[PDB]
Design a protein around this ligand. Structure first.
Ligand SMILES: *[C@@H]1O[C@H](CO)[C@@H](O)[C@H](O)[C@H]1NC(C)=O
Lengths: 49, 50
């Protein structure tokens, strides 16, 4: 994983260990808003016209 | 026309001409071009900036 991704992830994990559900779920929502709902594992470098 | 040898010898030609030539040319050209270009090359802010 990237650096920022791991940062956000272990941040939510510290929120869950810190039992703060509200801030935790909001941080997860921010994560999904900030990193999209899917990670790409394949693209096709090309062009079209 | 007219003629005689006794009482009534004359001449007449009341010739007439009426001509009326009218032309009406009417030309109307109209051109209208519209053309539009677009390019994009996007940019996002990193999710961890301050
Ligand atoms: C966390 O919150 C839950 C629910 O309020 C509570 O039962 C628990 O004692 C809290 N602490 C830990 C360490 O789970």
């Amino acid at each position: 994983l990237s650096l920022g991704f791991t940062k956000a992830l272990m941040d939510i994990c510290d929120q869950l260990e810190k039992n703060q559900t509200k801030m935790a779920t909001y941080l997860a929502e921010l994560l999904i808003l900030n990193y999209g709902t899917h990670v790409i594992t394949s693209v096709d470098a090309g062009a079209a016209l | 026309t007219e003629l005689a040898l006794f009482s009534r010898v004359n001449g007449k030609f009341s010739t007439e001409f009426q001509r009326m030539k009218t032309l009406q040319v009417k030309d109307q050209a109209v051109t209208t071009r519209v053309q539009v270009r677009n390019r994009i090359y996007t940019v996002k802010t990193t999710p961890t900036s301050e």
